[PDB]
Design a protein around this ligand. Sequence first.
Ligand code: NA
Ligand code: NA
Ligand code: NA
Ligand code: NA
Lengths: 89, 89, 89, 89
Amino acid sequence: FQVLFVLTILTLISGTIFYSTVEGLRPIDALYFSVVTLTTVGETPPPQTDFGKIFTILYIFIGIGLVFGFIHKLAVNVQLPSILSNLVP
Amino acid sequence: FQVLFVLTILTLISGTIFYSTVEGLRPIDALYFSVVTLTTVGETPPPQTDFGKIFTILYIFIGIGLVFGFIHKLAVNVQLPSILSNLVP
Amino acid sequence: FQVLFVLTILTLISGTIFYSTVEGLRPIDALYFSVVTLTTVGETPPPQTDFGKIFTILYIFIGIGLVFGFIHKLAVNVQLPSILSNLVP
Amino acid sequence: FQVLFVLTILTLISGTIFYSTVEGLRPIDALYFSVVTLTTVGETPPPQTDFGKIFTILYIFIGIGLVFGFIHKLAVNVQLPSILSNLVP
Ligand code: NA
Ligand code: NA
Ligand code: NA
Ligand code: NA
């Protein structure tokens, strides 16, 4: 979880650096693009540079497994227990 | 299932409260945004406030596991049985 | 697979009937909306009626598990075998 | 992994050929559409031809299982090991 947590953050930082410089986005919008791309939500418009498109294609393949792995350990063993160890008054 | 059902509803209510106030949406559109964000459908436009963006990023990480957990118990053991206990005339 | 296949089709037909009448879409665009909603792709705009929104919320929760179940049996045991029983010349 | 890798590439090439000719997209935008459709991100607009819509519906059902299978072997046994066989200095 600490590790998975670190990878995800490093992955989102990379994305954020990439999209602010190549697509011209403010940091916050570039992190947002990164997270909604990798969680496969995708509610923003697509990148407008060919360079953005290529990076996004590869970023998607490398990131998704990471992000979803983090999301899965996050849910199965930081929430349910918390949540369940929670019922038992 | 009752529990999972409750968490999902509380999660969608939070989202609904958040998006109506900070993004200025009518309740129904804010629930919709919440559900299509957390089911990773994402067919609406993205939030326009930095505050919306940040909450959405975190809401996505906490909610997805919840919503999908509910969806999964919903399908595996309220439908298939119903559906199957359904074939056998 | 035959069963899963039937449920998915009946689910897409319902969606198609719903969106053509309430949202005013041509059959083909309503099937498309249905499939891209339930596969969580979501690349179309969202429904414009409150009635569309509500149905979509519920359609998403009931359908996703169905559609993905079909997709999963489709891939694991109509493709891989086909595909693999395919290597062995 | 080599096999899964090949199928995904052949699947994206098909999509790319399809969307450049029928939807009139430059190769790169057609590959992009293909990848964001099959990874269920969906942040581009939808196809504008009925022919595009139909192919997309079927492409989605056949491709998703493929693409996600590749993504899953990619993550579980080209990254984690790499990543983990990485901690142990
Ligand atoms: Na999506
Ligand atoms: Na979208
Ligand atoms: Na998705
Ligand atoms: Na989307």
